Structures are given as structure tokens and as C-alpha cells.
Design a protein around this nucleic acid. Structure first.
Ligand SMILES: [Zn+2]
Lengths: 344, 140, 62
RNA sequence: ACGGCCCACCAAGCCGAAGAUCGGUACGGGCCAUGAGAGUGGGAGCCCGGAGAUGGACACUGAGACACGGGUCCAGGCCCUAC
RNA sequence: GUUACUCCAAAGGGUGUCCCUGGCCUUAGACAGCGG
RNA sequence: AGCCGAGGGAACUCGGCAAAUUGGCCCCGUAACUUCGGGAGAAGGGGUGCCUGCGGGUGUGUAACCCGCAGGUCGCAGUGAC
RNA sequence: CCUUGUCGGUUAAAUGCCGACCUGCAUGAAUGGCGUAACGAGGUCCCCACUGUCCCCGGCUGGGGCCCGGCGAAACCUCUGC
RNA sequence: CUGGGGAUAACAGAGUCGUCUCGGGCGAGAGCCCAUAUCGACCCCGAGGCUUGCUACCUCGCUGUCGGCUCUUCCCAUCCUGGCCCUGCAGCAGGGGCCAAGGGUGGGGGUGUUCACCCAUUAAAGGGGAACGUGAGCUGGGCUUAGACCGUCGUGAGACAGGUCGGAUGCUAUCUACCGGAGGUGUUGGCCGCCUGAGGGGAAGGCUCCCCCAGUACGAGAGGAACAGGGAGCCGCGGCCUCUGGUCUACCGGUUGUCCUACAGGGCAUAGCCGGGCAGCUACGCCGCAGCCGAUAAGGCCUGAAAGCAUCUAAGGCCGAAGCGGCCCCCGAAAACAGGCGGCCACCGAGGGCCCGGGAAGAAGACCCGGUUGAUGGGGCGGGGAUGUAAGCGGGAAGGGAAACCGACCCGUUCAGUCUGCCGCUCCCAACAGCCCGAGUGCUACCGGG
């Protein structure tokens, strides 16, 4: 008998097409600072830098090559506040409050907007929600946010999302939300340079693939390659049980999956397309523009490593639900070189 | 701190790639009787079903002597890879490769069986085995 | 963060790129591209190629 | 400095059974030992000459060297080191 | 355990509990303890 | 049914199955053994394009078909494909 | 037959191949015995070169497969079908 | 060869367990003395169904095969990894036993082999089951037809659970099963958007080495640990193309033979061959993968009687594992209590689809972006990039020729010429014109309010 591990993981099944291109966040981290727990942007491209190492471990204090991804982040708009209560099993929405003046383009996602809904009505609804929250029934408060893709001329149909707030007092959360609603919100007010983040997006699509590539199955002997079975698995199982088991590798959809990554470091936050290294203001956009993505012009995040998704895809970010015990400092590192040469 | 003055090992932060599987012939660079060796094992390695153990610069291997004075021929020895043809990365990002594949014969502890190495050797190997650069005239 | 100089085309290439080749006699060489590496090893003459600096060298040597 | 010493061209010549070529052993001589002598054997120590300086090759300077206590590289060994 | 049979594991052990019997000490007995 | 693949080079497999390597012409050189006829194209090594000219053979031939020489020059590669 | 017989050589490692030793279960002289140069799409062992055989698989080409229009069968079939 | 036979073998299955694998009871003794650290005769009692036999209940054209490759899963009687107990356990290591099946258990030589044997590594390189798992999955080396040789037996034709060479591998999926992808109905009027998260899946992580603790404890010496703290790597998993490599029948150049009369430009010969090569795809490249909380197992303790003492247990407490549950990741309103919230329409028409220009998406369907309240595709003009310096013109060129002229190749004009499955600006052309679905009800008990 020969032993070896099975081919592929069963933890990401069923391997099907994602429900939506806009990714959903299932869990939130416990933070003591009262702030919005995430942001959203669009992926632009990749480059590399040379920085002085900070994190614990060998290589500390030396100049190292580091791959980098760039995410364009125009400001979000806060258009609503939601209240949650506790039902029999879990949380259930108690009520919603919206802002009265919304951009003309929001109707491309939300086809049915209210007709008149003036400011005094909005304020009365805010007051009702305030008094409701001021009793003790309510358990959680969340913000309702929409992207503004028209500033960077990428498209006009926004993405609409819900974001949680940190802390442990509903009243503090509500004060924050009431001071935020109806306005534009920037990434520098939410994120801190040097943090660890979790990124969420839908992966690149690859269509239907066979088991060699979908599961890491082996290619058969060359006699079978000449017989007509090279890229096939041997058998679907034994005589008894007299059925095919769900654990047997098979062909199907590959790519376009919901996936989450852990502990990617935020290096720097840029403004208006520039980064400030040593007093200078340099452009991240390489000579000729990013391939399949043009010029960065509003604001951008520099994230260490790689992240799921194609280029113009929507990315969501949250802070470190599962960080290690020896975190690196929350401070922008010392950067000696940023590459902005042609990338095609 | 137990034993650092008389020492045979050190640490290197590069970890080159593994370019030479079991069955590879290596030219010997030390001034021992041996001239050509064959890899039959890689010290410290655990693999999987139908995988060949492979080695790169700085790794100790088990080998057999095919050419050289009769005293050494047909024996099983240990040796360290000191240069390889497959390029590997460093910390700044520039890749480095060499002109040939070569090794140097040592004792299971790490002590060379020879007094002279001919040609340049790799700083990774010299760092991981501190008793080699002493007997090497070029270390890049 | 130093820029290296190529031994075939003579141009500067950026940190994090290229190749260093080592000959067993210690002699070192720097390449910016597989193109230049391949041309060096096959034996194309750069003094004849109008996109190198050895070409201006030879133009003076005329 | 004469010279196949080397080169371009024109010829087919040169050595050899009186032993060429190839191999073995060996620094050469003046001299030494022995024997009645004819002869047989040896040729480290003193003199004349030749060659060599771990093995091999190549140069500078000088009247003169391809240099035993000067130089450059390869091979084969060794020594110091803050590597 | 909730099995008539078809179609249900033992030799060897148990201050686990509920009973029967037969001897021996007892108003200073059978442990521990003041005191050899 | 076909083309290419870094580093390693039979670790694959009953078994180098299949694929790959070599390849035309001129010159040099060529073993064991032998039924002296062979082995033998043994093995192995060097060269080959284009242009500018010079010579030889048979021939009455500035007709045709063959055999050599020197020099200049380009390419990663000159039986460059077949 | 016992048998992967014992010794030697070939490997890092030999139920193999080659060379010998005789205990020939059950060799043997025209049901021919022992050798043999040359020859063999015969069977078997080793070496050099070479390679996607393999480490570990990747990319590309053309024809199918898929969709659309047209023509248009057969094997098989108690009834059904967790 | 014909006819039959599961009335009758080989063959898997059923039954049985003599044999096989794994155990136990008692105590002769061995162990310097000391049965029980370890070993344990003779004699008695068992479990499993994984070895072989026995039987002949099933099948005589069900499949009649061994071994290997590939792929999935289960058991524990545990080889390593986690935690403990005794020892004839100083330490380092060893014996023996208890809890635990979450993860691991590999690479090679001869042989058709399974097994066994050997080699070098390794934390260790456990053993079984699933029709001796797996031929409508592969292979075909063995075995078991027809040809042939040797030995032996036989008068012979011939034979040998003796040896050797050679010797056919078919399928258009009817039902179910599984992997993925669509269209409907229902959820008691229709629709747009955001959420919840019952239930299901997870190994998403497992293991090793180095430094220090330390030449310390221990020990006569020789030798030689551990808790905490710092680093690195192997195996597995999930993603990406900045860097490096491969390919790149878009593209750029060089060159052979021939055809279009020669130049220049082209066709054919695998893209004719050779060299380079962006985007894209890929790995030989790069990025990421937690330890805590809670209850337990073996075990270690407290209190405490039955039994005035003693006793971890009979009632009660306190601790204690790579194991169980949660945090975390993936799927998830068909979750039949078939959900919550906000908003729009109905009680002509909200909304949706066909259509048009296109990808970041794609077997058909589906998904995403835009449609003049416009930079979606093309064109033009500019950036970046790949090749490698065009044609023509002029000047040289070894040499030949009275001279004119011929002449492979070189130089200059020239980072040129060609191309761009990338970026930006600009309404110059086309995103026009249309066409199709589409919700409306009543009775009873009403509820809460008129
Ligand atoms: Zn260059």
C-alpha cells in the first residue's frame, strides 16, 4: 500500500460561479476605535519597490524587493443608516433612513427612488430613528454607502454596499453615523498606514476546465496517452457503494469564485495620483499607462503582494480579522525606489 | 553560547531554487581525488509520491564517485553544491547564475576533505558553511 | 537602489531587473535582457548594431 | 653571425644487412681496481666539460640570464588571517 | 434490558447491591487511640 | 494528427515502447577476428556559401562537359529549404 | 527439481548478464557432438551519444467535438427505475 | 464438433473455523536474593473472519484472470506526531503498558511478480477492508488455445499442476448516480435593491531543523537534557503576473530552391528553415494560510462515608490531549414558520425582455459595460512598446577591361522603416429604428382600528 494526500481541498465546495460580482462580507472584526470598518476601490495594476525591512524575522533592517498592487479609491458617499434588532434566531433589520438628495446615476442601480421626500421629512425620520435607538431595543447600527465611479471616468453605474461601525455602544455608533450621513468619505479618514488588511473580490474567470488543472490530477502513463485517456482520471470509484461519490474529482467551472485573503500590509496612501517620498511628488502611473487600465488621477492604496481579481474589478477591504501575534509597526516604511517604467 | 569558535555552519537568507535532481553528475572543484560524482540523495529532504529529491547551492548531498584515483572510486561521500547553472534570486531582485554545476566534498559534520577550491563559489554556500570561503579564492 | 550597466548594449537598467553572469575565473557580467544575453552567447557583434554604444565607439574608430 | 633556422615557388630526393629506424641502460673524460702480461670490469669524493634548481611554459633588466637565496601563469603540496 | 424458536460469547473473578444458613467473641467486645 | 520547451538526462517502464540523435560530397585515418574473399561507409577527425580572377583534360573551337588554385566578403548557422 | 546452487567480475544496492566449479533429479556423438568468419525487421546483457520516457507538466497549430440550416438510420427495449 | 448440466470441479460469494492472525486464566520456574521490571513451560478458556482447507446452497457462456498505473473512501489490533503510568527508569537512550485514527507513512536495484532481500535518506519510512475496491479507466509482463525447440515418460499417435521464443483487448449512454450550467411553478397582488443566516462542507493546516536556555541539571568519569524565548525550511492548500524563465502559426528581421522577365515587391516548399519577440496563458517565478476560549478521555488531586480509622468515589468538587464544540473560511430564502427592511406600481400600466456597440464573462443559456443627459467600437492625431537602421540616391570596394563600365559587400542620408489582439485626446463614421411580455378576483372566521 502507498499513502499520499488527496488531490485538492474540500473546503471551497461547491466550486460554482459567484452569486454576484460585488463581494459580500460575512464577518467583522472587533475594534475599539469607533470608525467605519472598511473601504472599496478598483484594481489598477502592479509594480515593485525597494524598501527597508521592518517586520520581525531575518532580513530585518535590509533593503529588499517587494511586489506591490495599486487600488484606485475615489471617495464614497453615505446615503443611509440602518438599525438592527435581535429576533428569535439572529439579527433582523428594524428600519432604514435615507438621504433626500442623491446623484442622478444612483437610479441605474436603484430603479425606484422616492418622488418628493424633502429635507424636513428626512429630519423627522432621523428623529424617529434616534428616539427608537435611545431606548435599549437596538443592537447594531450600519452605514449604507455607494461608490462614485464617474469621477474617474470608468463607468456611471455605482456599486451599493453596507458597512459596519466599530465600538460597543449603539449610541456612539449612531452619533458617528449621524455626523456622517449625506456626505463624501475618504480613505485617509478610515485607514491608517501600516495596517494589516483582508481583501475580498471575485477571482478571474477561466471557464470549464478538466481535473488536471482544476484539482491537480496526474497525467496518465504514455500508453494511456496513446490510448485516449491521458488527461482523464482512472475510475469514479469502487463496486460498493454502487454510486459516484461527491469527493471524486471532475470537470466543471473554474475561476470566478468568492475568495478572501489574510494579512496584506498597507504600505502608503496616495492623493491625486502622487506619492511623496523625500519631499518630491512622483507619479505611480508608469510611462505609457497601466496595461488595460489608464491613468490614476484621484487617490490610491499601495498594498503588498497580490490580490484576487481582474484589473477593473471592484475590491473590498477590511482590517485584519485574524492577525498574527508579532505585527509590524503601524507606520509607513522607508522606501528607497519606486518603479514607474513601462509595463507592457 | 556553546560552540561558535570551532564551527561548521551558519545562516543564509536567500534559499536558492532546487535545480539538480537525483541522478545529476557534478564536477568536483576541491583538490581531492574525485573528479565526477553522481547525486543519490539530498540530506534532510522529504518528498511525495513519485517526486525526485533535488538540490541547489548550499545544500549537502550524498553522492557516489565515478572518476578519480582508485582510493575514492566506488565510495559514498557527502558534498556541498557551490555553483549551479539555473539562475536564482537575491534580496535586491537581480538574478544570478554560473557557468557550470560543481560541488565540494566534505565530512558529515561539514569539514572539507581538501585544501583548495578552484573557481568562484557562491556567497550562499560560503555563508551556510563557514569553513569553505577560507579555502576558496573567489566568493561572489 | 543603484542602476546597473549592461555589458552588451551599454545602457542603464533599473533595480530589481536583469541578470548577473559569473565565469569560473571570477569575471562578472551584467545583462538587462535575455535578448542581450542570447546575442552575447551566440556571438553577434554589437559594434555593428546601431542601437548600442559600441556602435558610436566603432564610428569614432573608423 | 653561416645555415630549412623560417617562408613562397621548382624538383624528388636522403638513411639503411658494413644494421638504418625503434627500444634498453647510462652524465662524458683525465683516471681507478685487478692481473706476469695480453686483458676484464668501474668511472660518487680531486680537476676539465655538460645539464638542473618542486613539474611545465613565458618574459623584463642588463656587456652577459630566459636567472639556485629576482618576475608572470598552470598543476601538485604547505603557512598566516581581524575571512 | 426492552429476543419463545428460526436468528443472542466463555474459563476465571467482584466489602457492587438484595437474601438464606452455621459457628466465635459481647457490656466491655471488633478499629483507632491516653498509657508498655 | 503535428511544432516548441528552462535545469537535469532513462531516476520511466517487463523491456529506452515512442520520440530524439546521425545523415549528401571531398580529404586524412581505420581494430579484434578471418573460410584471406572480408570485416569496412569499421570507428574517429577536418572542410563545404557568394563574389573577383588564374590555371588544366578531350576537343579546330573564347562551342559543350568535367578536374584544381589564389584572393575578398556576409551571416547564429553555407549537403542552410528538399 | 532443491535454485536467487557456490566463487569471481559488472552496480551505492543484481531472482539479471558474462566467466568458472561439477552434486549431469533427467547431456552426449549423422533422432549427429564440439567450434566457427560472413549474414539476421530472430532472442538477450552492457557502454558512449541523444532525448518531454520521467521529476512536472506548460504553450501554440489544423481536423472533430459545441451552436445554426438541410438529409436522416441502427444496435437495443417485460413494465418500471433514490 | 453436437447436444446438455450449477443434478458436478477450477472460479468469486454463502456456511464452518480444524488451521491461520490476535488474546486470556493458574502459576512450575528463569531473573545475584525476589513468579508477576521482563520472560513465562505443562494444562485449560476464547475473539476475528485478513491464510489455507472442508462442504457443494448460488451462477455453466453474468463477469471465467494475477500483477502494475490511476482515483476515492473506511476499521484499529498505533510505526511517527499529542498526553500519561510502571521499570532491574542517574542523565542520554531503552523495555513494557493506557487514552487517542486529526495529519503523515516516501525514493531506488535485480525479479512478470504480491511478498521477501538489499541501498541511501527519513520524525517514522504501520498493517488491513471495500466482488483478493477499481479492464462499458489504461496496460498486457505472467497465466490458460491454434506454431516451434530441449529434457523425461510412452511401440506409437502423444503427454508433463517441467523449461523456453512467439502469439486479437469491441460500445452512438435507455434509467439512475455524480460534477458544473440554464428555464419554470410555488411561497395567496406585481417589481427594484440591501440584509439575515437555519442547515450543510473544511486539514486548511501538518511536520522537521538551527540558535539560546547550556557543556548547565544529572553523573566518579565518559557523556549529556528540559520549560520559556528567537529564526528558517519541507509537505499540503488558496490565489497573482511587478520580477525571472517557457511558449507566443499577431509581428520584425536573415537565408536555401523554384515560379511571377531582371531590379523592387510577392506565391509555394511543416510558419520552408533559422534568430528575436509585446499583450495573453503559464511555472522553473511570486504573495498569503490563529491561537485562544469551553466541556472531556487516560491520568493527577481535594473533601468524604459505607467500615468511629483509612480510602481520588459511593453523593460532591478542582485540573488535565495533534482528539470534541466555538471563534475563522466556502455554499446557502425550496429554511413548507418557503424570512426581515426601504422604496415604486397596481387594487392605461411600474417594471422586465428582444434589438444595437462591445468584454474584464462565456460549450448553448447565463454575467458585465455603454447606447447622443454618450468616448462603446472604428478612423485621425499623439504616448509607450517589438524588431533592428528601409527603398532610392550618392560615394567606396578584392580585381577585370584600351576606355567607358562590371562587381559580392561597406559607408552616409538613418534609433531609421514596418507593425502594435496597450494608453490618452478628438463626435469624423456607426451605437438608429422598432418590437414583445406584464400585476387587477371572491367566500367564511376575522383580526386592529372606523
Ligand atoms: Zn544589454
Amino acid at each position: 500500500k502507498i499513502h499520499r494526500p488527496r488531490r485538492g481541498s474540500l473546503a471551497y465546495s461547491p466550486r460554482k460561479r459567484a452569486k454576484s460580482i460585488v463581494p459580500r462580507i460575512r464577518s467583522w472584526p472587533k475594534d475599539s476605535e469607533v470608525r467605519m470598518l472598511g473601504f472599496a476601490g478598483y484594481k489598477a495594476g502592479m509594480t515593485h519597490i525597494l524598501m527597508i525591512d521592518d517586520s520581525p524575522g531575518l532580513t530585518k533592517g535590509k533593503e529588499i524587493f517587494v511586489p506591490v498592487t495599486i487600488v484606485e479609491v475615489p471617495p464614497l458617499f453615505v446615503y443611509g443608516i440602518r438599525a438592527y434588532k435581535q429576533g428569535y434566531l439572529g439579527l433582523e433589520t428594524a428600519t432604514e433612513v435615507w438621504f433626500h438628495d442623491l446623484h442622478k446615476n444612483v437610479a441605474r442601480r436603484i430603479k425606484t427612488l422616492p418622488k418628493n421626500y424633502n429635507e424636513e421629512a428626512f429630519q423627522a425620520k432621523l428623529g424617529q430613528l434616534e428616539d427608537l435607538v435611545n431606548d435599549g431595543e437596538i443592537a447594531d447600527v450600519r452605514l449604507l454607502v455607494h461608490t462614485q465611479p464617474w469621477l474617474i471616468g470608468l463607468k456611471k453605474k455605482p456599486e451599493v454596499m453596507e458597512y459596519a461601525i466599530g465600538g460597543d455602544d449603539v449610541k456612539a455608533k449612531f452619533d458617528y453615523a449621524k455626523e456622517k450621513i449625506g456626505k463624501e468619505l475618504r480613505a485617509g479618514e478610515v485607514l491608517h498606514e501600516g495596517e494589516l488588511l483582508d481583501v475580498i473580490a471575485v477571482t478571474k474567470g477561466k471557464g470549464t476546465q478538466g481535473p488536471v488543472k482544476r484539482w491537480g490530477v496526474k497525467v496518465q502513463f504514455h500508453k494511456a496517452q496513446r490510448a485516449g485517456k491521458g488527461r482523464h482520471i482512472g475510475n469514479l470509484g469502487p463496486w460498493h457503494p454502487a454510486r459516484v461519490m461527491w469527493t471524486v474529482p471532475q470537470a466543471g467551472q473554474m475561476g470566478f469564485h468568492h475568495r478572501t485573503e489574510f494579512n496584506k500590509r498597507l504600505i502608503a496612501i496616495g492623493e491625486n495620483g502622487k506619492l511623496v517620498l523625500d519631499g518630491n511628488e512622483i507619479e505611480i502611473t508608469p510611462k505609457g499607462g497601466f496595461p488595460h487600465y489608464g491613468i490614476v488621477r484621484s487617490d490610491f492604496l499601495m498594498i503588498e503582494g497580490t490580490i484576487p481579481g481582474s484589473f477593473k474589478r471592484i475590491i473590498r477591504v477590511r482590517p485584519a480579522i485574524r492577525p498574527p501575534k508579532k505585527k509590524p509597526p503601524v507606520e509607513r516604511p522607508q522606501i528607497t525606489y519606486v518603479s514607474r517604467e513601462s509595463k507592457q | 553560547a556553546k560552540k561558535g569558535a570551532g564551527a561548521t555552519r551558519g545562516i543564509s537568507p536567500v534559499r536558492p531554487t532546487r535545480a539538480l535532481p537525483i541522478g545529476a553528475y557534478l564536477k568536483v572543484a576541491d583538490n581531492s581525488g574525485a573528479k565526477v560524482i553522481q547525486i543519490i540523495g539530498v540530506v534532510g529532504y522529504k518528498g511525495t509520491r513519485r517526486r525526485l529529491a533535488a538540490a541547489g547551492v548550499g545544500d549537502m548531498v550524498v553522492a557516489t564517485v565515478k572518476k578519480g584515483r582508485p582510493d575514492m572510486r566506488h565510495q559514498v561521500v557527502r558534498a556541498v553544491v557551490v555553483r549551479q547553472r539555473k539562475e536564482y534570486r537575491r534580496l535586491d531582485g537581480m538574478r544570478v547564475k554560473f557557468e557550470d554545476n560543481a560541488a565540494a566534498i566534505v565530512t558529515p559534520e561539514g569539514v572539507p576533505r581538501g585544501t583548495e577550491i578552484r573557481g568562484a563559489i557562491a556567497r550562499e554556500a560560503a555563508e551556510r558553511w563557514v569553513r569553505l570561503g577560507s579555502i576558496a579564492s573567489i566568493v561572489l | 537602489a543603484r542602476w546597473n550597466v549592461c555589458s552588451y548594449c551599454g545602457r542603464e537598467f533599473e533595480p530589481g531587473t536583469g541578470k548577473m553572469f559569473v565565469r569560473n575565473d571570477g569575471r562578472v557580467l551584467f545583462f538587462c535582457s535575455s535578448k542581450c544575453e542570447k546575442y552575447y552567447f551566440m556571438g553577434r557583434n554589437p559594434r555593428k548594431l546601431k542601437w548600442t554604444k559600441a556602435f558610436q565607439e566603432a564610428r569614432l574608430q573608423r
